[PDB]
Design a protein around this ligand. Structure first.
Ligand SMILES: CCCCCCCCCCCCCCCCCC(=O)OC[C@H](COP(=O)([O-])OCC(O)COP(=O)([O-])OC[C@@H](COC(=O)CCCCCCCCCCCCCCCCC)OC(=O)CCCCCCCCCCCCCCCCC)OC(=O)CCCCCCCCCCCCCCCCC
Ligand SMILES: CCCCCCCCCCCCCCCCCC(=O)OC[C@H](COP(=O)([O-])OCC(O)COP(=O)([O-])OC[C@@H](COC(=O)CCCCCCCCCCCCCCCCC)OC(=O)CCCCCCCCCCCCCCCCC)OC(=O)CCCCCCCCCCCCCCCCC
Ligand SMILES: CCCCCCCCCCCCCCCCCC(=O)OC[C@H](COP(=O)([O-])OCC(O)COP(=O)([O-])OC[C@@H](COC(=O)CCCCCCCCCCCCCCCCC)OC(=O)CCCCCCCCCCCCCCCCC)OC(=O)CCCCCCCCCCCCCCCCC
Ligand SMILES: CCCCCCCCCCCCCCCCCC(=O)OC[C@H](COP(=O)(O)OCCN)OC(=O)CCCCCCCCCCCCCCCCC
Ligand SMILES: CCCCCCCCCCCCCCCCCC(=O)OC[C@H](COP(=O)(O)OCCN)OC(=O)CCCCCCCCCCCCCCCCC
Ligand SMILES: CCCCCCCCCCCC(=O)OC[C@H](COP(=O)(O)OCC[N+](C)(C)C)OC(=O)CCCCCCCCCCC
Ligand SMILES: CCCCCCCCCCCC(=O)OC[C@H](COP(=O)(O)OCC[N+](C)(C)C)OC(=O)CCCCCCCCCCC
Ligand SMILES: CCCCCCCCCCCC(=O)OC[C@H](COP(=O)(O)OCC[N+](C)(C)C)OC(=O)CCCCCCCCCCC
Ligand SMILES: CCCCCCCCCCCC(=O)OC[C@H](COP(=O)(O)OCC[N+](C)(C)C)OC(=O)CCCCCCCCCCC
Ligand SMILES: CCCCCCCCCCCC(=O)OC[C@H](COP(=O)(O)OCC[N+](C)(C)C)OC(=O)CCCCCCCCCCC
Lengths: 105, 78, 183, 161, 95, 80, 149, 353, 192
């Protein structure tokens, strides 16, 4: 059994476990048909693309629009510029809005 | 990373040699960037037109399916 | 490793622009049913300086937390919350003891690591003083498993690789102990 | 503003109006450079550098062949085109840049969660070599075999003797 | 591709037009029409015509034939038998 | 624009221009492999990408030699 | 007879390297140490009287993924990517200031815009044929239909 | 002002660091042109430039300013794309290669685990920019020089790439800074003395320097690819060629002479013990010291570039191809098999640390 | 199918050569001289030049002997491999295999041998080399490593069969045999 889905550090990646449980199910001798392993196939494909999870987020965003809910009042706060991950945004006691250093670690 | 160094060199030389071809290409480039930045929705609506005419599940098609299930499920409880 | 991923900060802001990266916060605390625990507040250099003393003090709790992860069978982060809180408290206990017993020796070692690219080989002298102070006051010995006790690299008399730049504070503090302790 | 869009807009314009063979060997270099930069800044810096190391050597060999085969044909020839038909073609092309029609996959953003289990932390090239030289060593040895065939193949084609 | 597409009527027709642009005694030119008698060309006029007929058909008369040519029909015979299309580049044919 | 085969106008009118199109077309496959492998954190895809680059460079050399000898055949008199 | 005039340009070339190294070693090291002093400008610039000598942090090199997690973790504690702190306990704000990057997963622009590189049998199928997306939409619809059971 | 003025310097500080980095490299490149003529002059028992500026210190400035005040020769004002694209590609390539050169520990603009690949990849682009000058040009000397540039590139590219890979193999890393720090106890000149010669021979061929100056052979191709270049396009190509000489001299010092590591560890500690480490002045001196070690080693190889030009005649490029493919390649591929075998025999396979 | 007892699903290179029967050496010689002999036969069937017989030059017979020598070994290697796999009659090889394994087990030594390879590389090496003899006619690949993936259970060596009582091997339990998987991961479950 050759290795598949090898992470960048040589070990199993995020989705290897899903793939491994599919192989074990499909190759088990206790199974009359491949029907038991159908949910395991969807789980592996969901691990890679997250297509159903993205689809759920599509419904939640759309359902919030039709009820007039504010996107900025029900979502999660975010910052787009890395230089402005400031100590005030991070919540430090002596925080400030001055830019952080990202030029050279 | 070499496009960052070359881009100022190529762009100015492109305008020098072909000022009208460059202005038309650059003008169209900026117009779509204004469509995306200012949410004019022109590119999105073209995309929604292509999916509708080619039989893809559109954004409205997927939302209609949800509304059909929503009405079906509510009556199943009531 | 400088590979761009979707789980941490990337190389530059051109990477964020191409990925349209959003740095997202969550204002919600952990649920009240889960018991609270104070997180470890030490940064990279103090933690690396204290790595082998946290290992020598929390070995039972570190192994028990990791063994919980193996027995969790995928349900890892949920089923080992209680074991994880023990690990955090034990690690904070070591850092607490360092700042009360070996404060100057401890702060000397991780100030050298900050001065020396966080390479253990560059700060042997300050490490030796910290090892001596910790052993006398906390009875903790640094051990590198899998090798004989006399082949441990941190105890090598004449290492092949040595720091190019000398930490002046470590040189001064090493001389002071030489003339006062090993008479 | 994603300035790579403008770069590909200029490249598509010059591919429609290219006339001689030197311009084609420049369309190739004008294509690898956007690829290398975008790989460098988004997905893989390792393969951005591998592209530069290998394709440039292929480009110069390609260029030197143009010198030995340039045959006066397209310097004095005429093309018609039309500026209006060029720009209209590029406008219609620019309208549809959605290579995929999964709207949720293209619109919803995702994240990954980091873990500290990988304490032996090395570069992607070390893992690629670790697998290539151990598990897929047959693939490497066949590639070595194909490279040998090219050496013999080039000689039996070009050498008059 | 690399073969002639010439007919005896076209070569004669193109020969007559090229000979009509000169100062000839008569404009009624056929195959039997001689250069010295019917058209009235001296030594230099004849060779001006031959080179003019060379450029029209992209052919080159050999020295032996050119010195001994008498009639218009002989030129038409020569063009039909010796004309070849010029070789094209390696890209014109296969592309 | 793709379905009306607009790419047939972007390819130049020399045999070498067909070679460049083939290299660009294959390079599109490798960029797609690198993109998927990086998102999945899968080194098997990157091994595939490396194999494609080496193999694509082999056929570039084999095709060039055929075109090189094809041009020699035309310049065959070589009375010099 | 050592010709000193010939050795003058080498002295300036020697000083050329020393200009780069002298500036880079000191300017970068000072900035890292300055930004490691605290979470705001009044602590970075001003020097307290009761504080001891300034200990400097040298630039980092030969890093890996752990150093990226460490840098972000340091930022959440001190406001600097190379902050310094050996406190056994973090502040309360550290429990809720985690940073999670969310990014799109779209194919490169050169893949979906190059006039030649975007054309292939499978790319046309993905872009113009609805056969693939019809099947995958069934999977998504089953998720909401199966909620009631 | 005050506060706004003070933290605006912090907002511009790293740009000045780059400007100082650019200024430092251009000073060496400018005065390498002066040093070459001074070195050749005394070897040829003349003086070299000593009349332009005090003792000749402004000769480089005069050459640049005079060439920057000259008319640019081109068929039309809109034909800048022809003879300017080539010089810019060559200049941008060599300048970008300097981003990975560390003047001290961690003092490189770019640091990555693939700095070696970036170094080789960046310089290969400069080769492309040179051949662009003969872009269906009607100048037969430019056309004849473009053919020779490709022939030399095929010669040195394999040897230079493989030599750097052997050095990277001995440390099992492609980071340039790790390779320098791996030479604490031994400089790779001693174990790989044959490779240092081969690296320098490859550097001479890469930079088109004599005895491999077959591209710009004045006695053969008047000026080679530069015969039609005047004023600004000529300066940029001339500037990039001498930038490459400094780069390859600095790489010879990095791959085989320990980079910035001190000649004497005892003396290095003695000098640095005079300055308090709690003061910023210690790090200025250390930056001067470490770069000085790199400067001294690189100055010797920049001297060696001039030295070989003043002693050896030029070799024909068709002989260079046979020399690189029949002699250098078999030797280098022997060492690429030799070195791992030695290390495995003594259980000393390298790791990154 | 006339199957037999499985001895080793991936026999080591040295074991295959050592277990050569005298006929396997005989076929190795036949391959070595069969290649020069076929060059004589082909000339005899139809002369290469003209119509008269001409002995092929000595340089051709030298390279032909080398080609036949490798071909003879590959044939003999596949002949002996089938006995390990059980495809061919291997009664003699089973008795020899059982004696060698029981002898090594009684010495508390691995029947497979100690390896320079770590657990991954032993597993990887077995994946690459197992069943590779099926393509030995196309390109060579041999098992030259001491891995433990041989497709056999060492408990079958703990039952005395007919003609093995005079060996008097006292076999220890498998957890005391050096360099075996079942006696390697004592302290850590991910380190041998
Ligand atoms: C230090 C070593 C030299 C020394 O002691 O003093 C001589 C040296 C001055 O040379 P000098 O006084 O003319 O020599 C005495 C006679 O004139 C010299 O009279 P001479 O020319 O008749 O003597 C000849 C002598 C040459 O003179 C020497 O001895 C020089 C030694 C050369 C080898 C070491 C360099 O011997 C040689 O010819 C040997 C040359 C062959 C060696 C080739 C290199 C092999 C490696 O004094 C100095 O060291 C300081 C001056 C150096 C310049 C400093 C400022 C440089 C400007 C930089 C910008 C600021
Ligand atoms: C062993 C000497 C040998 O190969 O035959 C002498 C053979 C004939 O040399 P010669 O003085 O020109 O003989 C004049 C006639 O042309 C030679 O006419 P010839 O017909 O007498 O020689 C042709 C030769 C055919 O020779 C081969 O097939 C070469 C096999 C290598 C593959 O046929 C044989 O004699 C077969 C027995 C000798 C080769 C046995 C190779 C066993 C595989 C290893 O020399 C070579 O073929 C040398 C090639 C190998 C060079 C060394 C490659 C180094 C690779 C490892 C480097 C790292 C360590
Ligand atoms: C289109 C392209 C297709 C690809 C084509 C390319 C062809 C590739 C196929 C070549 C083989 C593929 C595998 C390559 C990877 C090898 C890496 C590897 O195995 O390293 C582990 C291996 C060490 O790992 P290990 O688990 O400790 O195994 C120890 C012995 O190797 C194993 O135990 P042992 O019982 O063999 O004891 C060793 C000692 C045994 O000597 C004794 O003490 C007497 C015992 C009885 C031996 C008497 C019969 C000997 C036969 C004559 O002497 C030997 O038997 C030397 C073994 C090599 C025999 C000749 C190899 C045949 C090549 C044809 O490294 C080696 O030394 C392998 C042997 C030498 C490498 C062979 C290279 C062949 C080329
Ligand atoms: C340092 C900057 C170097 C480049 C600066 C010069 C800018 C010119 C365009 C650079 C590349 C942009 C895309 C062009 C692809 C090649 C198409 C081409 O034929 O070159 C365009 C050039 C203009 O000729 P023009 O007169 O406008 O058209 C012919 C009219 N019958 O016709 C020519 O033959 C001149 C080409 C000169 C040699 C250029 C070699 C290619 C260099 C590309 C490096 C950058 C990669 C591309 C980045 C931009 C991508 C669009
Ligand atoms: C072919 C000869 C292989 C036999 C040999 O000389 O070396 C084998 C030897 C393995 O034996 P040993 O030292 O006992 O390993 C300890 C196991 N725990 O140790 C080794 O495996 C050394 C590796 C042998 C490689 C020899 C060179 C290979 C030839 C390439 C052509
Ligand atoms: C050496 C040394 O003491 O360096 C002092 C330096 C430079 O001396 P230089 O002779 O120009 O170094 C050039 C190096 N060569 C001679 C090897 C080419 O001078 C000062 O800046 C003071
Ligand atoms: C580099 C720093 C050393 C300057 C050399 C110098 O000041 O050079 C002296 C200059 C140039 O005149 P020159 O004829 O080339 O001098 C050479 C003398 N010779 C012939 C004996 C060798 O004279 C002057 O003062 C005139 C100009 C006014 C001062 C401005 C100088 C340029 C400033 C730009 C660089 C800072
Ligand atoms: C060949 C001549 C250069 C040479 O021999 O240079 C190598 C030697 C010896 O230095 P090393 O043993 O390589 O280690 C380098 C040890 N430092 C760090 C003390 C230099 O340097 C010199 O003696 C100068
Ligand atoms: C295993 C240990 C490796 C040793 C490492 C060094 C390898 C060098 C190989 C040289 C072979 C050679 O010079 O080759 C000579 C070849 C071709 O010569 P040919 O036509 O065959 O005639 C010679 C054959 N004879 C004599 C047997 C008949 O061209 C040359 O003249 C190359 C000249 C290179 C000079 C470059 C100057 C570099 C200066 C360096 C200052 C720091
Ligand atoms: C033990 C160490 C020494 C062994 C030397 C054996 C030499 C054999 C030889 O040279 O074999 C002789 C043959 C044929 O000779 P010829 O020159 O064609 O003609 C013969 C002479 N005449 C004209 C008088 C008849 O040459 C070859 O096949 C050369 C193949 C060598 C390839 C090497 C490539 C570089 C690889 C280096 C490692 C990376």
């Amino acid at each position: 059994a050759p290795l598949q889905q090898v992470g960048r550090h040589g070990g199993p990646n995020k989705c290897f476990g899903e793939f491994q449980r599919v192989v074990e199910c499909m190759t088990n001798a206790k199974h009359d048909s491949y029907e038991p392993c159908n949910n395991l196939k969807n789980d592996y494909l969901e691990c890679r693309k997250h297509k159903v999870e993205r689809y759920k987020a599509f419904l939640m965003q759309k359902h919030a629009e039709e009820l007039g809910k504010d996107p900025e009042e029900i979502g999660a706060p975010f910052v787009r510029k890395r230089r402005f991950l400031t100590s005030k945004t991070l919540g430090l006691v002596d925080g400030d809005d001055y830019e952080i250093g990202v030029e050279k670690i | 990373p070499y496009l960052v160094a070359f881009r100022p060199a190529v762009l100015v030389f492109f305008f020098i040699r072909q000022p009208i071809g460059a202005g038309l290409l650059a003008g169209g480039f900026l117009f779509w960037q204004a469509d995306r930045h200012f949410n004019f929705g022109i590119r999105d609506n073209i995309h929604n037109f292509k999916q509708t005419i080619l039989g893809f599940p559109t954004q409205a098609s997927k939302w209609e399916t949800f509304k059909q299930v929503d009405a079906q499920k509510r009556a199943q409880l009531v | 490793s400088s590979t761009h991923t979707n789980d941490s900060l990337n190389s530059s802001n051109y990477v964020d622009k191409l990925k349209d990266t959003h740095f997202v916060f969550e204002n919600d605390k952990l649920p009240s049913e889960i018991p609270d625990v104070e997180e470890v507040g030490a940064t990279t250099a103090p933690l690396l300086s204290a790595a082998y003393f946290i290992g020598a003090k929390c070995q039972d709790y570190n192994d028990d937390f990791m063994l919980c992860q193996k027995e969790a069978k995928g349900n890892g982060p949920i089923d080992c919350l209680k074991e994880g809180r023990r690990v955090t408290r034990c690690a904070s206990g070591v850092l607490k003891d360092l700042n009360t017993h070996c404060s100057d020796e401890f702060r000397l070692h991780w100030q050298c690591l900050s001065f020396s690219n966080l390479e253990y080989k560059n700060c042997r002298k300050a490490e030796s003083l910290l090892n001596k102070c910790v052993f006398e006051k906390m009875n903790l010995v640094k051990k590198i498993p899998g090798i004989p006790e006399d082949r441990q690299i941190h105890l090598k008399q004449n290492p092949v690789l040595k720091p190019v730049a000398l930490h002046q504070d470590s040189e001064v503090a090493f001389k002071k102990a030489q003339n006062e302790n090993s008479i | 503003m994603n300035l790579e869009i403008l770069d590909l807009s200029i490249l598509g314009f010059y591919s429609l109006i290219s006339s001689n063979s030197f311009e084609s060997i420049a369309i190739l270099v004008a294509t690898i450079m956007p690829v290398i930069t975008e790989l460098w800044y988004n997905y893989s810096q390792l393969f951005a550098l591998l592209y530069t190391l290998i394709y440039v050597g292929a480009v110069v060999i390609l260029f030197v062949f143009i010198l030995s085969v340039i045959n006066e044909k397209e310097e004095y020839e005429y093309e018609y085109s039309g500026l209006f038909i060029l720009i209209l073609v590029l406008l219609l092309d620019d309208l549809d840049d959605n290579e995929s029609n999964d709207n949720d996959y293209n619109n919803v953003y995702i994240t990954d969660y980091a873990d500290w289990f990988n304490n032996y932390n090395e570069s992607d090239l070390s893992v690629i070599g670790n697998l290539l030289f151990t598990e897929y060593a047959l693939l490497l040895l066949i590639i070595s075999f194909i490279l040998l065939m090219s050496i013999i193949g080039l000689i039996l084609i070009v050498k008059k003797d | 591709q690399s073969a002639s597409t010439l007919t005896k009527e076209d070569v004669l027709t193109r020969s007559v037009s090229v000979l009509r642009g000169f100062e000839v005694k008569t404009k009624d030119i056929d195959l039997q029409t001689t250069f010295v008698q019917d058209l009235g060309m001296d030594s230099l006029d004849l060779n001006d015509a031959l080179v003019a007929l060379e450029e029209e058909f992209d052919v080159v008369f050999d020295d032996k034939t050119a010195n001994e040519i008498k009639t218009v029909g002989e030129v038409v015979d020569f063009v039909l038998a010796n004309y070849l299309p010029t070789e094209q580049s390696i890209n014109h044919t296969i592309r | 624009m793709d379905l009306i085969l607009l790419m047939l106008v972007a390819v130049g009118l020399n045999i070498i221009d067909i070679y460049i199109m083939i290299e660009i077309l294959i390079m599109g496959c490798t960029v797609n492999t690198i993109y998927s492998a990086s998102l999945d954190n899968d080194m098997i895809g990157l091994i595939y990408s490396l194999i494609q680059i080496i193999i694509a460079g082999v056929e570039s050399a084999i095709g060039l030699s055929i075109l090189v000898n094809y041009n020699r055949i035309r310049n065959s008199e070589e009375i010099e | 007879m050592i010709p000193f005039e010939a050795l003058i340009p080498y002295a300036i070339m020697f000083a050329g390297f020393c200009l780069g190294g002298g500036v880079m070693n000191s300017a970068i090291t000072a900035d890292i140490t300055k930004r490691a002093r605290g979470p705001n400008q009044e602590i970075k610039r001003n020097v307290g009287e009761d504080e001891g000598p300034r200990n400097y942090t040298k630039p980092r090199y030969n890093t890996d993924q752990w150093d990226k997690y460490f840098a972000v973790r340091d930022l959440r504690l001190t406001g600097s990517l190379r902050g310094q702190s050996d406190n056994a306990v973090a502040e309360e704000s550290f429990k809720t200031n985690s940073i999670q990057p969310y990014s799109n997963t779209r194919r490169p622009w050169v893949l979906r815009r190059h006039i030649i590189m975007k054309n292939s049998p499978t790319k046309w199928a993905r872009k113009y044929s609805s056969r693939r997306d019809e099947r995958e939409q069934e999977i998504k619809d089953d998720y909401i239909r199966g909620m009631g059971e | 002002m005050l506060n706004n003025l003070f933290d605006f310097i912090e907002y511009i500080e790293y740009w000045l660091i780059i400007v100082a980095f650019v200024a430092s490299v251009l000073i060496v490149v400018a005065y390498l042109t002066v040093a070459e003529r001074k070195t050749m002059g005394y070897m040829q028992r003349r003086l070299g430039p000593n009349a332009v500026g005090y003792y000749g210190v402004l000769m480089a400035v005069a050459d640049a300013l005079k060439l920057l005040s000259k008319e640019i020769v081109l068929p039309h004002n809109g034909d800048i794309i022809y003879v300017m694209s080539g010089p810019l590609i060559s200049l941008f390539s060599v300048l970008l290669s300097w981003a990975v050169i560390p003047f001290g520990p961690g003092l490189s603009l770019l640091d990555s685990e693939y700095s070696i690949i970036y170094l080789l990849a960046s310089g290969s682009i400069g080769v492309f920019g040179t051949v662009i000058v003969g872009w269906m040009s009607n100048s037969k000397y430019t056309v004849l020089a473009t053919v020779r540039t490709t022939a030399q590139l095929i010669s040195y590219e394999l040897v230079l790439t493989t030599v750097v890979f052997i050095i990277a193999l001995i440390v099992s890393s492609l980071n340039i800074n790790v390779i320098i720090e791996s030479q604490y106890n031994i400089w790779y000149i001693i174990p790989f003395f044959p490779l240092c010669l081969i690296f320098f021979i490859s550097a001479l061929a890469e930079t088109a320097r004599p005895p491999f100056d077959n591209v710009e052979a004045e006695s053969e191709l008047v000026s080679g690819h530069m015969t039609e270049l005047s004023a600004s396009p000529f300066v940029i190509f001339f500037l990039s060629e001498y930038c490459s000489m400094v780069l390859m001299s600095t790489l010879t010092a990095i791959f085989f002479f320990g980079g910035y590591l001190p000649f004497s560890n005892t003396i290095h500690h003695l000098i640095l013990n005079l300055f308090d480490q709690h003061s910023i002045y210690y790090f200025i001196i250390e930056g001067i010291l470490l770069s000085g070690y790199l400067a001294i080693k690189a100055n010797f190889f920049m001297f060696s570039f001039v030295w070989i030009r003043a002693a050896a005649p030029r070799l024909r490029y068709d002989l260079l191809i046979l020399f690189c493919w029949y002699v250098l390649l078999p030797i280098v591929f022997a060492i690429v098999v030799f070195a791992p075998g030695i290390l495995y025999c003594f259980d000393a396979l390298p790791v990154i640390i | 199918m006339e199957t037999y007892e499985l001895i080793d699903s991936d026999p080591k290179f040295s074991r295959v050569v050592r277990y050569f029967r005298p006929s396997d050496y005989l076929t190795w010689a036949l391959g070595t001289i069969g290649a020069p002999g076929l060059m004589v036969l082909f000339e005899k069937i139809e002369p290469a030049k003209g119509n008269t017989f001409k002995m092929p030059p000595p340089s051709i017979m030298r390279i032909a002997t080398t080609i036949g020598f490798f071909g003879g070994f590959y044939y003999a290697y596949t002949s002996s491999t089938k006995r390990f796999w059980g495809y061919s009659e291997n009664a003699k090889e089973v008795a020899k295999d059982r004696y060698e394994v029981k002898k090594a087990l009684s010495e508390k030594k691995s029947p497979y041998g100690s390896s320079l390879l770590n657990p991954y590389q032993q597993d990887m090496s077995a994946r690459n080399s197992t069943n590779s003899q099926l393509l030995l006619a196309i390109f060579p690949w041999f098992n030259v490593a001491n891995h433990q993936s041989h497709g056999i259970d060492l408990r079958k060596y703990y039952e005395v069969r007919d003609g093995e009582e005079n060996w008097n091997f006292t076999l220890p339990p498998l957890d005391q045999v050096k360099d075996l998987d079942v006696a390697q991961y004592k302290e850590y479950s991910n380190y041998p």
